[PDB]
Amino acid sequence: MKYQQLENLECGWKWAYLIRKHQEGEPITKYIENSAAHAAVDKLIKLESEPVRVLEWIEQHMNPDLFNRMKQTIRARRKRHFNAEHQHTRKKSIDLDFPVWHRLSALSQRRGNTLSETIVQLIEDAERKEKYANQ
Amino acid sequence: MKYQQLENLECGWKWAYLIRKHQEGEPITKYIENSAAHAAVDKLIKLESEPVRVLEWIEQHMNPDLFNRMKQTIRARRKRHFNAEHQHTRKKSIDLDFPVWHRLSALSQRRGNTLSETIVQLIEDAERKEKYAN
Amino acid sequence: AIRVTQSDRDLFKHLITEATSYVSADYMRHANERRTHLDEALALRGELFG
Amino acid sequence: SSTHIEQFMPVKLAQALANSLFPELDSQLRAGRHIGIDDLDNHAFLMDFQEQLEEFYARYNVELIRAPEGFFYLRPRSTTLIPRSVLSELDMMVGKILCYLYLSPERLANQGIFTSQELYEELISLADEGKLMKFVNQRSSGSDLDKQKLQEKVRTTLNRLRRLGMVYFLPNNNNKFTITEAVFRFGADVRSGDDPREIQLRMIRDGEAMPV
Amino acid sequence: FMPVKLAQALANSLFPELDSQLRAGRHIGIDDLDNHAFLMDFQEQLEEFYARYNVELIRAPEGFFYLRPRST
Amino acid sequence: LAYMEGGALRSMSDKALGALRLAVADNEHLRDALRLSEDPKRPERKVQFFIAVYQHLRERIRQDIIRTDDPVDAIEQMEIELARLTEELTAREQKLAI
DNA sequence: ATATATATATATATATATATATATATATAT
DNA sequence: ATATATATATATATATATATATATATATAT
DNA sequence: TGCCGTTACAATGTAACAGTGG
DNA sequence: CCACTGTTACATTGTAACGGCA
């Protein structure tokens, strides 16, 4: 375990995720009957200020589909929350044109390294050229 | 004008955008009184499936300050919609670690190029170095 | 009157204590790490200058 | 969504207007009756939904106003949708006297229960007997018939103020009464330590008091 | 709570003036097009609203509306 | 708190937030401020929220004698008043019994 | 000095909701 | 093969809330 | 200017892989 | 083995800022 797990924060995250999914129209409940699903959703809504019971609501009415997406989303949210503290640990999102991305990805799988590592090697070669021009 | 604009599509986009914003708590309407805002929002909700009247609804009840954001969101939606048809026109999104991004952007502002142009030039130089050696 | 005053006092006590607990801890945490980062940066600076 | 109260009205205003106390309070208020701390139920109702009722009555171009003493009432505007009226000068004399009795400790033994005779005695003690009588009848010169007429006029004005809520007759006695904090409005021209002629202009500008 | 359509009727901007004129005893005939139409539309609830005041909202055979006070 | 480390501070802050969630559910704008305060990218928000808390309790003062606007100060006056009320209650119940 | 309008209280009748006790049909023990 | 217990339906009547009408006090006005 | 394309981001959600410890 | 965690590489949508163009 590298990231501290906080219960009262991850529980709130989970509740918000469930509410977002439902309001998006998805069937968070495991119930096919409309009435039981509605009752479970209403109770979940009441659980707004009690994130602790959200775990129990999960164990009682959460759709079996969502375990993987849940554990993925909350894991990623935890990682991002802990990384956002410092800039040097932050991430920057950029968009690339298809030809450029195609060439870059081909180069990276050729070198067997991540995109950031490939960019590091490339920019380092350019900066090495600049340095040798300078010395 | 590069992309032709389609009403039954862009109007649905606008309706969905406004509904999303309202669900997010944004004040869609210009009415400070909660009753008029709620009435207008209900009209909008029941206004689904209507371009020619959602446009009028916007003209009549729309919040003044969201016009630009909605306009640019629709611009981006249109451009993405037209570009997502072909592979060469699509765009690939990636995440770069902050130091790497800082250095790459340093190069891009220094040279006046965009990220795509800067990376293309750098890769081309790397390829040229390979060919020099090879 | 007794009920009302008791509720008010309890609410005030709880709110104040919990708000202080919630905020001051993060404040101290940040202060501590800022101190630590400064300490580390000075060593880096000295080594760099040499 | 449709069929939803918030579409038209705030929830609390609708709840207040549907309350059993709303109609009697509204009828009394529109009649001009002041509300004091004694009507615990009505006073509490006003406190709870004070804002809803001020905004509601604003639709009539009349301000629901709570004096600092804590008693609510209505002040119509020039464009009032509900008519407006001004008290008589004799009404002012008697109202000022009642404020004095409310604040007067000498009569503390009365314990708040006062008779019209005592009110008349205090009034004549502090006011100008004959020059005040002049208003009751232009041809008065101290005649005891006109004296009885003035007593009767004071009784009638007292009844009217009772109608306005400034005074309560006792559950069984109409010849004895208890004063209410609303009477403090009769001192609004002197509650502020400033020049009387400026407080008068301020008040008339506020619509609080017209001249004669 | 409150009936929804009753709430709609009360909120209507015509309600203050019409209410004042009714409580003043005025009779609303066919000449007052807006008020008469409003009363036609929302009678089912203004009758209840004014029955809360122990008063009856009566539509005469001629058509004009008015308020009849009860003993209470 | 200077002595402890980041982990304990974070854990107890999480616990305090858990308490707050209950203590704040009633309020809407203050609850919203509490929710906003959780962003790690803007720690100052936390302080802002704290201010609001005071700016809330300040208005909950009842009457003149409790106008020690410092909320922590009013506690002692309130406790004194509770004791006083205890005595008055005793007197009133005795009166009622007789 | 007395006619008249207004507010208040009481009795009286209406109408509705509801609990109680009995009668009837069926079930089940002897 | 019989008699007792259950559930159902019904009228009774009990109480409440409403609305009406009359008497009263009494405050105004001629 | 006012629209319109365009870029460079931000925030969150997912799938997939790699690690880690029991 | 097995589960849970950390990480990367996207996608998806929104936004602000430039710059082109009538």
The Cα-based distances of F42 to A91, A108, D150, F45 in angstroms read 17, 36, 76, 6
Q: E68 has which bridge partners?
A: E56
Q: Which amino acid makes up residue F64?
A: D
Same domain, B26 and B67: yes
**E16 touches D at CB < 8 Å:** yes
Question: Tokens 């960019």 belong to which residue?
Answer: A119
Q: Which residues contact D131 (CB under 8 A, 6 or more apart)?
A: none
DSSP class of residue E65? Answer: E
C1' of J12 to CA of E54 (Å): 62
**Rounded to whole angstroms, how far apart are CA atoms B33 and D137?**
55
**Rounded to whole angstroms, how far apart are CA atoms D160 and D87?**
10
**Rounded to whole angstroms, how far apart are CA atoms E10 and D26?**
15
In contact, B3 and B79? CB cutoff 8 Å = yes
Residue D37 backbone phi and psi in degrees, to 5: -65, -25
Evaluated on CA atoms D111, D116, D118, D122, the torsion sign reads positive
In contact, C8 and F60? CB cutoff 8 Å = yes
C1' of G29 to CA of B45 (Å): 68
Per CA to C1' distance, which residue is closest to J14? Answer: B73
In contact, B63 and B27? CB cutoff 8 Å = yes
Burial D106-142 (b: 16+ CB within 10 A, else e): eeeeeeeebebeebbebbbeeeeeeebbeebeeebee
In contact, E50 and E68? CB cutoff 8 Å = no
Pick from B31, B32, B33, B34 the residue to mutate for testing the D interface (most D CBs within 10 Å). B34
In contact, D46 and D53? CB cutoff 8 Å = yes
**Rounded to whole angstroms, how far apart are CA atoms F21 and F18?**
5
Q: Which residues contact B120 (CB under 8 A, 6 or more apart)?
A: A100, A103
In contact, D24 and D30? CB cutoff 8 Å = no
How far is B94 from chain A, CA to nearest CA, in Å? 5
Neighbours of chain E (3+ CB pairs under 8 A): D
**Rounded to whole angstroms, how far apart are CA atoms E59 and E28?**
9
Q: In terms of CA atoms, which chain B residue is nearest residue D1?
A: B42
The Cα-based distances of B59 to B19, B68, D69, D120, D203 in angstroms read 16, 14, 49, 69, 45
Q: Write out the two tokens for E64.
A: 């004009």
* Helix or strand run (H / E) with residue D160: helix D144-163
Question: Tokens 């909660």 belong to which residue?
Answer: B34
Q: Which amino acid makes up residue B34?
A: N
Residue D203 backbone phi and psi in degrees, to 5: -60, -50
Q: Which residues contact B25 (CB under 8 A, 6 or more apart)?
A: none
Domains D5-76 and D89-187 share a fold: yes
User: What is the strand order of the sheet D113-115 is part of?
Assistant: D113-115, D176-179, D167-169
Q: Name the CATH architecture for the domain at D5-76.
A: Orthogonal Bundle (1.10)
**Rounded to whole angstroms, how far apart are CA atoms A21 and C16?**
35
The SS3 of residue D75 is: strand
Same domain, B44 and B107: no
Q: Which residues contact C19 (CB under 8 A, 6 or more apart)?
A: F16, F20, F49, F50, F53
Nearest in space to D93 (alpha carbons), one of D199, D175, D183, D191: D183
Nucleotides of H under 7 A from a protein CB: 19-22, 25-28
CATH number, domain containing residue A54: 1.20.1270.380
In contact, E67 and E57? CB cutoff 8 Å = yes
Assess whether D160 (CB) lies less than 7 A from strand H. yes
Q: Which residues contact B82 (CB under 8 A, 6 or more apart)?
A: B3, B89
The experimental technique behind this entry is: cryo-EM
**Rounded to whole angstroms, how far apart are CA atoms B104 and F67?**
60
| CATH classification number, D89-187, choose in 1.10.3720.10, 1.10.10.60, 1.10.10.2260, 3.40.50.300 | 1.10.10.2260
Nearest in space to D153 (alpha carbons), one of D133, D180, D182, D168: D133
Evaluated on CA atoms B79, B82, B83, B88, the torsion sign reads negative
Q: In terms of CA atoms, which chain C residue is nearest residue F76?
A: C9
Q: How many CB atoms lie within 10 A of CB B28?
A: 20
Domain ranges for chain D: 5-76, 89-187
Query: In this structure, are strands D167-169 and D176-179 parallel, antiparallel, or unpaired?
Result: antiparallel
**Rounded to whole angstroms, how far apart are CA atoms D98 and D107?**
12
Length of chain F: 98
Q: In terms of CA atoms, which chain D residue is nearest residue E1?
A: D15
Q: Write out the two tokens for E59.
A: 């539509």
The Cα-based distances of C25 to A8, C21, D18, F5, F46 in angstroms read 16, 6, 49, 10, 11
Pick from D4, D6, D8, D52 the residue to mutate for testing the B interface (most B CBs within 10 Å). D6
Burial D143-155 (b: 16+ CB within 10 A, else e): eeebbeebeebbe
Length of chain B: 134
Q: Which amino acid makes up residue D9?
A: M
Same domain, A80 and A109: no
**Rounded to whole angstroms, how far apart are CA atoms C8 and C5?**
5
Per CA to C1' distance, which residue is closest to J21? Answer: B1
Subunit contact A94:B94, Cβ cutoff 8 A: yes
Q: Write out the two tokens for D8.
A: 């038209």
DSSP class of residue F65? Answer: G
Same domain, A115 and A59: no
* Helix or strand run (H / E) with residue A91: strand A91-97
User: Treating both helix axes as pointing N-terminal to C-terminal, what angle do A98-111 and A115-134 enclose, rounded to 10 degrees?
Assistant: 90
Nearest in space to E28 (alpha carbons), one of E56, E54, E62, E55: E62
**Rounded to whole angstroms, how far apart are CA atoms F75 and F83?**
13
Assess whether A88 (CB) lies less than 7 A from strand J. no
**Rounded to whole angstroms, how far apart are CA atoms A91 and A79?**
11
Q: Write out the two tokens for D80.
A: 């009032």
Residue D79 backbone phi and psi in degrees, to 5: -100, 35
**Rounded to whole angstroms, how far apart are CA atoms B62 and B52?**
15
**Rounded to whole angstroms, how far apart are CA atoms D90 and A104?**
98
B1 found inside a domain: no
Subunit contact A6:F7, Cβ cutoff 8 A: no
**Rounded to whole angstroms, how far apart are CA atoms F13 and C18?**
9
**Rounded to whole angstroms, how far apart are CA atoms D167 and D97?**
12
Of E11, E20, E23, the CB nearest to D9: E11
Nearest in space to F33 (alpha carbons), one of C23, A46, B21: C23
Subunit contact F6:C32, Cβ cutoff 8 A: yes
Same domain, A85 and A112: no
Q: Which residues contact D147 (CB under 8 A, 6 or more apart)?
A: D133
- CA atoms lying within 13 Å on the CB side of residue B95: 4
Assess whether D156 (CB) lies less than 7 A from strand H. yes
DSSP class of residue C25? Answer: H
Question: Tokens 């009262």 belong to which residue?
Answer: A8
**Rounded to whole angstroms, how far apart are CA atoms F8 and C25?**
9
Q: In terms of CA atoms, which chain D residue is nearest residue E72?
A: D24
Same domain, B70 and B16: yes
Max CA pair span of chain E: 35
Same domain, B55 and B110: no
Nearest in space to F61 (alpha carbons), one of F53, F69, F52: F69
Q: How many CB atoms lie within 10 A of CB D192?
A: 13
Question: Terminal CA-to-CA distance of chain A, rounded, Å?
Answer: 45
Q: What counts of helices (H) and strands (E) characterise chain E? A: 3, 2
Pick from B23, B29, B31, B35 the residue to mutate for testing the D interface (most D CBs within 10 Å). B35
In contact, E57 and E27? CB cutoff 8 Å = no
**Rounded to whole angstroms, how far apart are CA atoms D33 and D25?**
9
Subunit contact E2:D14, Cβ cutoff 8 A: yes
Subunit contact F40:A52, Cβ cutoff 8 A: no
Nucleotide nearest to E72 (CA to C1'): H19
The Cα-based distances of D119 to D29, D145, D149, D158 in angstroms read 26, 19, 15, 10
C1' of G25 to CA of A35 (Å): 40
Q: Write out the two tokens for A127.
A: 């900066």
B44, with CB counted inside 10 A (0-12, 13-18, 19+), is buried
The alpha-helical segments, DSSP class H, found in chain A are 7-23, 34-46, 52-61, 67-83, 98-111, 115-134
Max CA pair span of chain D: 75
The alpha-helical segments, DSSP class H, found in F1-98 are 6-24, 29-36, 44-57, 71-97
Same domain, B63 and B21: yes
**Rounded to whole angstroms, how far apart are CA atoms B11 and B75?**
12
Question: Tokens 């006046």 belong to which residue?
Answer: B112
Same domain, A79 and A106: no
- Resolution as reported, in Å: 6.3
Q: Name the CATH architecture for the domain at E1-69.
A: Orthogonal Bundle (1.10)
CATH number, domain containing residue A106: 1.10.1220.10
**Rounded to whole angstroms, how far apart are CA atoms D42 and D24?**
9
| CB pairs < 8 Å spanning A and B | 83
Q: Distance between alpha carbon B69 and the CA centroid of its chain, in Å?
A: 9
C1' of I21 to CA of A75 (Å): 18
In contact, D133 and D146? CB cutoff 8 Å = yes
B68 found inside a domain: yes
Q: Which residues contact B60 (CB under 8 A, 6 or more apart)?
A: none
DSSP class of residue A115? Answer: H
Chains F and A touch (3+ CB pairs under 8 A): yes
Q: Distance between alpha carbon B20 and the CA centroid of its chain, in Å?
A: 14
* Helix or strand run (H / E) with residue E67: strand E65-69
Subunit contact B38:D10, Cβ cutoff 8 A: no
Determine the Cα angle at D129 with ends D127 and D132, to 5°. Answer: 75
A117 found inside a domain: yes
Write out chain F residues lying below 8 Å of C11, CB-based: 23
Question: Terminal CA-to-CA distance of chain F, rounded, Å?
Answer: 57
Q: Which amino acid makes up residue C10?
A: D
**Rounded to whole angstroms, how far apart are CA atoms D173 and D171?**
6
DSSP class of residue D105? Answer: S
Length of chain D: 212
Same domain, B77 and B15: yes
Q: Which residues contact F37 (CB under 8 A, 6 or more apart)?
A: F45, F46, F48, F49
**C22 touches F at CB < 8 Å:** yes
C1' of G12 to CA of D23 (Å): 28
Per CA to C1' distance, which residue is closest to I13? Answer: A73
Nearest in space to E50 (alpha carbons), one of E32, E35, E72: E72
**Rounded to whole angstroms, how far apart are CA atoms B99 and A92?**
10
As for how many domains chain B has, the answer is 2
Domain that holds residue B56: 7-89
Q: How many CB atoms lie within 10 A of CB D29?
A: 22
Nearest in space to E23 (alpha carbons), one of D60, D13, D73, D49: D60
Same domain, B70 and B12: yes
Q: D95 has which bridge partners?
A: none
Determine the Cα angle at F71 with ends F67 and F76, to 5°. Answer: 80
Evaluated on CA atoms B97, B103, B109, B113, the torsion sign reads negative
Question: Terminal CA-to-CA distance of chain B, rounded, Å?
Answer: 47
B96, with CB counted inside 10 A (0-12, 13-18, 19+), is buried
Same domain, A67 and A118: no
How far is A134 from chain B, CA to nearest CA, in Å? 17
Q: Distance between alpha carbon B9 and the CA centroid of its chain, in Å?
A: 15
Q: Write out the two tokens for E9.
A: 């009727």
Which phi-psi region, left, alpha or beta, contains residue B97 (left: φ > 0; alpha: ψ -120 to 50)?
Answer: beta
Residues at the binding site of C for (R)-4'-phosphopantetheine are 42, 46
Q: Distance between alpha carbon C48 and the CA centroid of its chain, in Å?
A: 33
Write out chain A residues lying below 8 Å of F36, CB-based: none
The alpha-helical segments, DSSP class H, found in B62-97 are 67-83
